[PDB]
Short mmCIF file of N, CA and C and ligand atoms in Angstrom, two decimals:
data_model
loop_
_atom_site.label_atom_id
_atom_site.label_comp_id
_atom_site.label_asym_id
_atom_site.label_seq_id
_atom_site.Cartn_x
_atom_site.Cartn_y
_atom_site.Cartn_z
N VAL M 604 46.02 51.12 210.88
CA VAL M 604 47.25 51.93 211.00
C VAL M 604 48.53 51.06 211.07
N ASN M 605 49.45 51.44 210.31
CA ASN M 605 50.83 50.76 210.36
C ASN M 605 51.90 51.87 210.53
N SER M 606 53.16 51.38 210.64
CA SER M 606 54.33 52.19 211.05
C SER M 606 55.04 52.79 209.91
N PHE M 607 54.64 52.55 208.68
CA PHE M 607 55.31 53.19 207.53
C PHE M 607 55.12 54.69 207.55
N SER M 608 56.23 55.49 207.34
CA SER M 608 56.20 56.93 207.54
C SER M 608 56.78 57.65 206.32
N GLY M 609 56.23 58.77 205.96
CA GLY M 609 56.77 59.61 204.94
C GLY M 609 56.47 59.16 203.52
N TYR M 610 55.50 58.25 203.32
CA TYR M 610 55.16 57.78 201.95
C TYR M 610 54.15 58.76 201.31
N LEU M 611 54.32 58.88 200.02
CA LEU M 611 53.28 59.51 199.18
C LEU M 611 52.31 58.43 198.78
N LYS M 612 51.02 58.75 198.85
CA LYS M 612 49.97 57.80 198.47
C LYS M 612 49.66 57.92 197.01
N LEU M 613 49.83 56.84 196.26
CA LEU M 613 49.50 56.88 194.82
C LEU M 613 48.13 56.44 194.49
N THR M 614 47.67 55.44 195.19
CA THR M 614 46.27 54.86 195.01
C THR M 614 45.80 54.42 196.38
N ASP M 615 44.64 53.76 196.30
CA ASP M 615 44.04 53.25 197.52
C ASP M 615 45.02 52.33 198.30
N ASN M 616 45.84 51.57 197.50
CA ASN M 616 46.67 50.56 198.19
C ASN M 616 48.15 50.68 197.91
N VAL M 617 48.63 51.58 197.13
CA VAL M 617 50.04 51.69 196.73
C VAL M 617 50.63 53.05 197.22
N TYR M 618 51.75 52.98 197.91
CA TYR M 618 52.46 54.06 198.51
C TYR M 618 53.94 54.03 198.03
N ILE M 619 54.56 55.17 198.03
CA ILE M 619 55.91 55.28 197.47
C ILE M 619 56.78 56.24 198.24
N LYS M 620 58.05 55.94 198.35
CA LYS M 620 58.98 56.83 199.14
C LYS M 620 60.39 56.70 198.51
N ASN M 621 61.14 57.82 198.54
CA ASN M 621 62.57 57.82 198.21
C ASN M 621 63.28 57.28 199.43
N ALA M 622 63.72 55.99 199.40
CA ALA M 622 64.31 55.38 200.53
C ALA M 622 65.19 54.25 200.14
N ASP M 623 66.19 53.94 200.98
CA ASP M 623 66.99 52.71 200.88
C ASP M 623 66.17 51.62 201.58
N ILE M 624 65.81 50.61 200.79
CA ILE M 624 64.96 49.53 201.32
C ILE M 624 65.59 48.84 202.48
N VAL M 625 66.93 48.77 202.48
CA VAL M 625 67.61 48.17 203.64
C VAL M 625 67.41 48.98 204.90
N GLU M 626 67.57 50.25 204.80
CA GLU M 626 67.40 51.13 205.99
C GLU M 626 65.91 51.16 206.39
N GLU M 627 65.06 51.15 205.41
CA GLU M 627 63.59 51.12 205.76
C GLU M 627 63.24 49.85 206.41
N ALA M 628 63.68 48.68 205.96
CA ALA M 628 63.40 47.45 206.62
C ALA M 628 63.95 47.44 208.01
N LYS M 629 65.16 47.88 208.26
CA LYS M 629 65.71 47.84 209.54
C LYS M 629 64.95 48.73 210.53
N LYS M 630 64.34 49.73 210.07
CA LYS M 630 63.58 50.66 210.97
C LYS M 630 62.11 50.19 211.15
N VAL M 631 61.45 49.67 210.08
CA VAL M 631 60.05 49.30 210.26
C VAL M 631 59.91 47.81 210.76
N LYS M 632 60.85 46.94 210.39
CA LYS M 632 60.73 45.53 210.73
C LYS M 632 59.45 45.08 210.20
N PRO M 633 59.21 45.20 208.89
CA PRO M 633 57.86 44.83 208.36
C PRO M 633 57.65 43.30 208.43
N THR M 634 56.38 42.90 208.41
CA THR M 634 56.05 41.47 208.32
C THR M 634 56.76 40.86 207.04
N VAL M 635 56.73 41.56 205.90
CA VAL M 635 57.23 41.10 204.63
C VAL M 635 58.09 42.18 204.01
N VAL M 636 59.36 41.86 203.70
CA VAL M 636 60.17 42.60 202.71
C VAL M 636 60.36 41.77 201.45
N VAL M 637 60.18 42.41 200.33
CA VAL M 637 60.38 41.78 199.05
C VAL M 637 61.80 41.94 198.60
N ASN M 638 62.39 40.83 198.12
CA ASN M 638 63.69 40.90 197.46
C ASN M 638 63.44 40.74 195.98
N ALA M 639 64.26 41.48 195.21
CA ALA M 639 64.41 41.37 193.82
C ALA M 639 65.39 40.28 193.46
N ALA M 640 64.85 39.06 193.48
CA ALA M 640 65.60 37.84 193.35
C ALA M 640 65.81 37.38 191.91
N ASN M 641 66.75 36.55 191.71
CA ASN M 641 66.86 35.76 190.46
C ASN M 641 66.51 34.28 190.76
N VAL M 642 66.38 33.48 189.73
CA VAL M 642 65.89 32.12 189.88
C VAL M 642 66.80 31.22 190.75
N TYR M 643 68.06 31.59 190.83
CA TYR M 643 69.07 30.82 191.60
C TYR M 643 69.18 31.32 193.01
N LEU M 644 68.52 32.39 193.36
CA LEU M 644 68.66 33.11 194.65
C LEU M 644 70.15 33.38 194.93
N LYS M 645 70.83 33.83 193.87
CA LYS M 645 72.21 34.30 194.00
C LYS M 645 72.14 35.84 194.24
N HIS M 646 72.30 36.29 195.45
CA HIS M 646 72.08 37.70 195.77
C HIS M 646 73.35 38.49 195.70
N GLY M 647 73.76 38.73 194.42
CA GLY M 647 75.04 39.34 194.17
C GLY M 647 75.10 40.85 194.18
N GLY M 648 74.01 41.47 193.68
CA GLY M 648 74.02 42.90 193.47
C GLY M 648 72.61 43.45 193.38
N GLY M 649 72.57 44.74 193.10
CA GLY M 649 71.27 45.44 193.18
C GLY M 649 70.61 45.32 194.53
N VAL M 650 69.26 45.31 194.60
CA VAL M 650 68.55 45.14 195.85
C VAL M 650 68.98 43.88 196.57
N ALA M 651 69.06 42.72 195.85
CA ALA M 651 69.36 41.54 196.51
C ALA M 651 70.71 41.51 197.15
N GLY M 652 71.75 42.01 196.50
CA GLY M 652 73.05 42.13 197.03
C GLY M 652 73.03 42.95 198.31
N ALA M 653 72.31 44.04 198.29
CA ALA M 653 72.20 44.97 199.49
C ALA M 653 71.50 44.25 200.62
N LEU M 654 70.34 43.65 200.39
CA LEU M 654 69.59 42.97 201.48
C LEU M 654 70.47 41.88 202.03
N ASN M 655 71.11 41.08 201.19
CA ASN M 655 71.93 39.97 201.75
C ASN M 655 73.08 40.46 202.55
N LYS M 656 73.81 41.52 202.11
CA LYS M 656 74.86 42.12 202.87
C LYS M 656 74.40 42.50 204.22
N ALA M 657 73.24 43.13 204.35
CA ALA M 657 72.69 43.58 205.56
C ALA M 657 72.42 42.43 206.54
N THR M 658 72.16 41.24 206.03
CA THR M 658 72.02 39.99 206.89
C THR M 658 73.33 39.32 207.19
N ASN M 659 74.46 39.88 206.79
CA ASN M 659 75.72 39.29 207.07
C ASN M 659 75.87 37.95 206.27
N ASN M 660 75.21 37.85 205.15
CA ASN M 660 75.26 36.66 204.22
C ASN M 660 74.35 35.53 204.78
N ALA M 661 73.63 35.72 205.86
CA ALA M 661 72.71 34.67 206.32
C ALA M 661 71.60 34.37 205.23
N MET M 662 71.11 35.49 204.60
CA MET M 662 70.13 35.27 203.53
C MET M 662 70.67 34.30 202.41
N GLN M 663 71.98 34.47 202.01
CA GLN M 663 72.51 33.63 201.03
C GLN M 663 72.68 32.24 201.49
N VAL M 664 73.13 31.98 202.73
CA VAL M 664 73.21 30.67 203.32
C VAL M 664 71.89 29.91 203.28
N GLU M 665 70.83 30.66 203.74
CA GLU M 665 69.48 30.03 203.78
C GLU M 665 69.04 29.74 202.32
N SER M 666 69.28 30.63 201.40
CA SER M 666 68.89 30.52 199.98
C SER M 666 69.60 29.34 199.37
N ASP M 667 70.88 29.11 199.60
CA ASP M 667 71.61 28.03 198.99
C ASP M 667 70.99 26.72 199.42
N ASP M 668 70.55 26.54 200.71
CA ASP M 668 69.93 25.35 201.17
C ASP M 668 68.60 25.18 200.46
N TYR M 669 67.84 26.33 200.28
CA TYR M 669 66.51 26.23 199.60
C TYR M 669 66.68 25.69 198.22
N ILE M 670 67.65 26.20 197.46
CA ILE M 670 67.90 25.83 196.08
C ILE M 670 68.36 24.31 196.05
N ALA M 671 69.26 23.93 196.94
CA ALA M 671 69.71 22.57 196.93
C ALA M 671 68.53 21.57 197.09
N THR M 672 67.56 21.94 197.91
CA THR M 672 66.40 21.18 198.18
C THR M 672 65.35 21.19 196.98
N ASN M 673 65.09 22.44 196.50
CA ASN M 673 63.88 22.64 195.64
C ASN M 673 64.21 22.98 194.22
N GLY M 674 65.44 23.24 193.87
CA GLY M 674 65.81 23.73 192.55
C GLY M 674 65.44 25.15 192.36
N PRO M 675 65.67 25.66 191.19
CA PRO M 675 65.52 27.09 190.92
C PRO M 675 64.00 27.55 190.86
N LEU M 676 63.78 28.77 191.19
CA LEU M 676 62.46 29.36 190.96
C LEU M 676 62.18 29.57 189.49
N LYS M 677 60.91 29.81 189.16
CA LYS M 677 60.49 30.25 187.87
C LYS M 677 60.57 31.76 187.72
N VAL M 678 60.92 32.27 186.53
CA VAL M 678 60.77 33.71 186.30
C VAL M 678 59.32 34.02 186.39
N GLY M 679 58.94 35.02 187.22
CA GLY M 679 57.58 35.34 187.60
C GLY M 679 57.15 34.69 188.92
N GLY M 680 57.99 33.82 189.49
CA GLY M 680 57.63 33.12 190.70
C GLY M 680 58.31 33.68 191.91
N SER M 681 58.06 33.01 193.07
CA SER M 681 58.51 33.50 194.35
C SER M 681 58.65 32.37 195.34
N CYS M 682 59.39 32.71 196.45
CA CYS M 682 59.32 31.79 197.63
C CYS M 682 59.42 32.71 198.83
N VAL M 683 58.89 32.22 199.95
CA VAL M 683 58.89 32.87 201.27
C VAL M 683 60.01 32.21 202.10
N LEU M 684 60.98 33.08 202.52
CA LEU M 684 62.08 32.60 203.42
C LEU M 684 62.12 33.57 204.62
N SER M 685 63.03 33.34 205.45
CA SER M 685 63.24 34.24 206.62
C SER M 685 63.58 35.67 206.20
N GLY M 686 63.12 36.66 207.05
CA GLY M 686 63.51 37.98 206.88
C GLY M 686 64.76 38.36 207.71
N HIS M 687 65.31 37.40 208.42
CA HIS M 687 66.50 37.62 209.17
C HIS M 687 66.35 38.81 210.10
N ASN M 688 67.30 39.75 210.10
CA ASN M 688 67.28 40.92 210.97
C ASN M 688 66.50 42.09 210.30
N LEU M 689 65.91 41.81 209.14
CA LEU M 689 65.26 42.90 208.40
C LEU M 689 63.73 42.92 208.43
N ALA M 690 63.12 41.76 208.64
CA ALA M 690 61.66 41.62 208.57
C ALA M 690 61.32 40.26 209.10
N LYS M 691 60.06 39.96 209.36
CA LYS M 691 59.65 38.63 209.74
C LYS M 691 60.02 37.64 208.61
N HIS M 692 59.57 38.03 207.40
CA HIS M 692 59.76 37.16 206.23
C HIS M 692 60.29 37.96 205.05
N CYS M 693 61.05 37.29 204.23
CA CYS M 693 61.42 37.86 202.92
C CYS M 693 60.70 37.03 201.82
N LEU M 694 59.93 37.78 200.99
CA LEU M 694 59.32 37.26 199.80
C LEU M 694 60.31 37.48 198.62
N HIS M 695 60.96 36.40 198.22
CA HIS M 695 61.92 36.47 197.05
C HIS M 695 61.10 36.38 195.76
N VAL M 696 61.03 37.45 194.99
CA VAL M 696 60.22 37.53 193.81
C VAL M 696 61.12 37.68 192.56
N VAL M 697 60.98 36.85 191.58
CA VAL M 697 61.74 36.93 190.31
C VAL M 697 60.99 37.66 189.25
N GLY M 698 61.39 38.90 188.97
CA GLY M 698 60.95 39.67 187.85
C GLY M 698 61.78 39.27 186.67
N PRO M 699 61.24 39.44 185.44
CA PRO M 699 62.06 39.25 184.27
C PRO M 699 63.25 40.19 184.23
N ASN M 700 64.39 39.64 183.81
CA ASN M 700 65.60 40.45 183.62
C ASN M 700 65.69 40.67 182.12
N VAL M 701 65.48 42.02 181.72
CA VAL M 701 65.63 42.38 180.37
C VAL M 701 67.00 42.11 179.86
N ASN M 702 68.01 42.30 180.65
CA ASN M 702 69.40 41.98 180.24
C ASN M 702 69.69 40.50 180.04
N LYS M 703 68.72 39.64 180.32
CA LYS M 703 68.77 38.30 179.93
C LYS M 703 67.78 37.90 178.82
N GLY M 704 67.00 38.89 178.36
CA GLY M 704 66.06 38.61 177.26
C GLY M 704 64.74 38.02 177.71
N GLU M 705 64.40 38.12 178.98
CA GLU M 705 63.19 37.50 179.55
C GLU M 705 61.94 38.37 179.19
N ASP M 706 60.79 37.69 179.02
CA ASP M 706 59.61 38.29 178.53
C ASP M 706 59.03 39.28 179.57
N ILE M 707 58.90 40.53 179.22
CA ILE M 707 58.40 41.58 180.16
C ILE M 707 56.97 41.28 180.54
N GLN M 708 56.23 40.55 179.76
CA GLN M 708 54.87 40.23 180.24
C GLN M 708 54.94 39.48 181.55
N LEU M 709 56.03 38.78 181.86
CA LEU M 709 56.13 38.06 183.08
C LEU M 709 56.16 38.96 184.29
N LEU M 710 56.25 40.28 184.07
CA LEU M 710 56.28 41.24 185.22
C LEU M 710 55.00 41.22 185.93
N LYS M 711 53.88 41.10 185.20
CA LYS M 711 52.52 41.06 185.91
C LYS M 711 52.54 39.75 186.78
N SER M 712 52.90 38.64 186.28
CA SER M 712 52.93 37.41 187.07
C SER M 712 53.72 37.56 188.29
N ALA M 713 54.91 38.24 188.20
CA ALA M 713 55.78 38.49 189.36
C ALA M 713 55.04 39.31 190.43
N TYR M 714 54.40 40.39 190.06
CA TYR M 714 53.69 41.24 191.02
C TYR M 714 52.46 40.51 191.60
N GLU M 715 51.87 39.49 190.90
CA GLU M 715 50.80 38.77 191.52
C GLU M 715 51.13 38.11 192.76
N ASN M 716 52.43 37.78 192.95
CA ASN M 716 52.89 37.15 194.20
C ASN M 716 52.61 38.04 195.41
N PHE M 717 52.66 39.33 195.22
CA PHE M 717 52.40 40.26 196.35
C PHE M 717 51.01 40.15 196.92
N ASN M 718 50.07 39.67 196.06
CA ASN M 718 48.64 39.55 196.56
C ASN M 718 48.44 38.48 197.65
N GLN M 719 49.45 37.64 197.84
CA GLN M 719 49.38 36.65 198.91
C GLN M 719 49.75 37.19 200.31
N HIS M 720 50.05 38.50 200.37
CA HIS M 720 50.50 39.16 201.62
C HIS M 720 49.77 40.47 201.80
N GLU M 721 49.23 40.66 202.99
CA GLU M 721 48.33 41.82 203.19
C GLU M 721 49.10 43.13 203.14
N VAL M 722 50.31 43.16 203.63
CA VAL M 722 51.14 44.37 203.65
C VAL M 722 52.63 43.96 203.31
N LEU M 723 53.23 44.77 202.42
CA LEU M 723 54.60 44.47 202.03
C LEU M 723 55.43 45.73 201.88
N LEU M 724 56.67 45.70 202.19
CA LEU M 724 57.66 46.67 201.77
C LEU M 724 58.48 46.07 200.56
N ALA M 725 58.56 46.85 199.48
CA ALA M 725 59.05 46.29 198.22
C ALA M 725 59.81 47.28 197.37
N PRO M 726 60.69 46.79 196.52
CA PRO M 726 61.21 47.55 195.41
C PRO M 726 60.37 47.41 194.19
N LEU M 727 60.57 48.35 193.21
CA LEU M 727 60.04 48.07 191.89
C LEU M 727 60.64 46.88 191.15
N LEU M 728 59.79 45.89 190.88
CA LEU M 728 60.27 44.67 190.23
C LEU M 728 60.82 44.94 188.81
N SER M 729 61.87 44.27 188.50
CA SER M 729 62.60 44.31 187.20
C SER M 729 63.23 45.69 186.99
N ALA M 730 63.26 46.61 187.91
CA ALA M 730 63.96 47.88 187.78
C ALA M 730 65.43 47.72 188.05
N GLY M 731 66.18 48.82 188.06
CA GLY M 731 67.64 48.75 188.34
C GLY M 731 68.34 47.85 187.39
N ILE M 732 69.17 46.95 187.92
CA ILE M 732 69.98 46.14 187.12
C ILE M 732 69.23 45.06 186.31
N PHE M 733 67.90 44.88 186.62
CA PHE M 733 67.06 43.98 185.82
C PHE M 733 66.62 44.63 184.48
N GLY M 734 66.85 45.92 184.26
CA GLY M 734 66.82 46.45 182.97
C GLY M 734 65.47 46.99 182.45
N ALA M 735 64.41 46.81 183.22
CA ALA M 735 63.04 47.27 182.74
C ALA M 735 62.92 48.74 182.99
N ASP M 736 61.97 49.36 182.35
CA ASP M 736 61.59 50.75 182.63
C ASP M 736 60.85 50.84 183.92
N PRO M 737 61.40 51.55 184.92
CA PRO M 737 60.72 51.69 186.26
C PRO M 737 59.37 52.30 186.14
N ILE M 738 59.13 53.18 185.22
CA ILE M 738 57.78 53.79 185.09
C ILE M 738 56.79 52.69 184.69
N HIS M 739 57.20 51.82 183.72
CA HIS M 739 56.36 50.65 183.45
C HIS M 739 56.16 49.74 184.60
N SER M 740 57.17 49.46 185.36
CA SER M 740 57.06 48.58 186.50
C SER M 740 56.10 49.21 187.53
N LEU M 741 56.13 50.42 187.79
CA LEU M 741 55.21 51.09 188.68
C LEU M 741 53.70 50.90 188.16
N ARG M 742 53.54 51.10 186.85
CA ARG M 742 52.21 50.98 186.29
C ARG M 742 51.70 49.51 186.47
N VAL M 743 52.51 48.55 186.17
CA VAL M 743 52.16 47.15 186.38
C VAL M 743 51.81 46.89 187.84
N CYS M 744 52.62 47.42 188.73
CA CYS M 744 52.40 47.28 190.16
C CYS M 744 50.99 47.79 190.55
N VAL M 745 50.72 49.02 190.19
CA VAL M 745 49.44 49.60 190.57
C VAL M 745 48.26 48.82 189.98
N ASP M 746 48.43 48.37 188.77
CA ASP M 746 47.35 47.64 188.06
C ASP M 746 47.23 46.16 188.45
N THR M 747 48.14 45.63 189.25
CA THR M 747 48.22 44.19 189.56
C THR M 747 48.04 43.94 191.10
N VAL M 748 48.77 44.66 191.91
CA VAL M 748 48.81 44.48 193.30
C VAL M 748 47.52 45.13 193.91
N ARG M 749 46.78 44.32 194.73
CA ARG M 749 45.57 44.68 195.44
C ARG M 749 45.80 44.88 196.95
N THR M 750 46.86 44.23 197.46
CA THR M 750 47.22 44.35 198.87
C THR M 750 48.01 45.64 199.05
N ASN M 751 48.38 45.98 200.30
CA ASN M 751 48.95 47.27 200.61
C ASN M 751 50.43 47.17 200.42
N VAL M 752 50.99 47.92 199.48
CA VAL M 752 52.34 47.87 199.12
C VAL M 752 52.99 49.25 199.36
N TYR M 753 54.17 49.18 200.04
CA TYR M 753 55.00 50.34 200.29
C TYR M 753 56.27 50.22 199.44
N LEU M 754 56.37 50.99 198.45
CA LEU M 754 57.49 50.95 197.50
C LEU M 754 58.60 51.87 197.94
N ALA M 755 59.87 51.31 198.02
CA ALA M 755 61.02 52.04 198.34
C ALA M 755 61.83 52.24 196.98
N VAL M 756 62.09 53.48 196.65
CA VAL M 756 62.86 53.79 195.46
C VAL M 756 64.21 54.47 195.93
N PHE M 757 65.30 53.80 195.66
CA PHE M 757 66.61 54.25 196.13
C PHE M 757 67.02 55.60 195.54
N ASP M 758 66.84 55.74 194.21
CA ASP M 758 67.37 56.92 193.51
C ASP M 758 66.36 58.05 193.59
N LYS M 759 66.81 59.21 194.19
CA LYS M 759 65.92 60.39 194.30
C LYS M 759 65.46 60.91 192.98
N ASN M 760 66.40 61.02 192.02
CA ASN M 760 66.02 61.46 190.66
C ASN M 760 64.91 60.59 190.03
N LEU M 761 65.08 59.24 190.20
CA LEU M 761 64.05 58.34 189.71
C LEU M 761 62.77 58.45 190.45
N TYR M 762 62.81 58.65 191.78
CA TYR M 762 61.61 58.79 192.57
C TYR M 762 60.79 60.00 192.04
N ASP M 763 61.51 61.13 191.91
CA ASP M 763 60.76 62.33 191.44
C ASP M 763 60.18 62.14 190.06
N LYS M 764 60.87 61.39 189.19
CA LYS M 764 60.30 61.15 187.87
C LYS M 764 59.12 60.24 187.96
N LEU M 765 59.19 59.21 188.83
CA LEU M 765 58.00 58.30 188.98
C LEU M 765 56.80 59.04 189.46
N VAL M 766 56.98 59.87 190.46
CA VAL M 766 55.85 60.65 190.96
C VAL M 766 55.31 61.63 189.93
N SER M 767 56.21 62.39 189.29
CA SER M 767 55.81 63.45 188.40
C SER M 767 55.16 62.89 187.16
N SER M 768 55.44 61.65 186.76
CA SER M 768 54.82 61.04 185.57
C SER M 768 53.71 60.10 185.87
N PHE M 769 53.27 59.98 187.12
CA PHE M 769 52.30 58.96 187.47
C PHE M 769 50.95 59.41 187.03
N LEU M 770 50.20 58.48 186.37
CA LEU M 770 48.88 58.78 185.92
C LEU M 770 47.90 58.22 186.92
O1 LIG U 1030 69.06 46.67 191.69
C1 LIG U 1030 68.73 47.71 191.06
O2 LIG U 1030 69.20 48.11 190.04
C2 LIG U 1030 67.59 48.64 191.78
F1 LIG U 1030 67.46 49.70 190.98
C3 LIG U 1030 67.95 49.09 193.21
N1 LIG U 1030 66.91 48.64 194.12
C4 LIG U 1030 66.78 49.18 195.41
N2 LIG U 1030 65.47 49.45 195.81
C5 LIG U 1030 65.31 49.94 197.03
N3 LIG U 1030 66.15 50.18 198.01
C6 LIG U 1030 67.47 49.77 197.64
N4 LIG U 1030 68.56 49.89 198.42
C7 LIG U 1030 69.65 49.49 197.70
C8 LIG U 1030 70.96 49.47 198.24
C9 LIG U 1030 71.87 49.04 197.31
BR1 LIG U 1030 73.77 48.99 198.06
C10 LIG U 1030 71.61 48.58 196.02
C11 LIG U 1030 70.31 48.68 195.60
C12 LIG U 1030 69.31 49.06 196.39
C13 LIG U 1030 67.86 49.23 196.34
C14 LIG U 1030 65.75 48.62 193.24
C15 LIG U 1030 66.21 47.91 192.00
C16 LIG U 1030 66.19 46.42 192.27
C17 LIG U 1030 65.03 46.22 191.31
C18 LIG U 1030 65.31 47.69 190.77
#
């Protein structure tokens, strides 16, 4: 038993809710919140901009030190940093950005990072301003992640479409 509330169960291990991931993280304080990161950990907009704003820019400060030490992530890769006031840990995961021409096959590699964590709160990777089809992202999630994932979908219209079209 965990504290996630109001989710629709899609499969044995995947759950979904129409929710603001920032508000959900602040209420649940999960062990892991996933950020929709880019390789530079520049958290300007989308989910990343919202999560970073909620940390009063502490996420960005920590991220800039990470990059200065380690260099950029790979598309499809991840790193574990602090969750600040939102979670114990933040798993920064880089999905391919279609608006940069990145290979959508890398979306499966991106979701594989979730399997290193028993339970996660997450957005749909490569959705929103990353330009991929969220229905496809949900399909890859379900077919790749084996650990327990709680997906927060900000847009109610999109949430209803994801549920109603789910196979
Ligand atoms: O960035 C995009 O375009 C997204 F559509 C939006 N994301 C979110 N997901 C879940 N809760 C979210 N709360 C927010 C608050 C603000 Br302000 C901005 C974005 C979000 C957000 C998912 C997405 C990132 C990968 C696809």
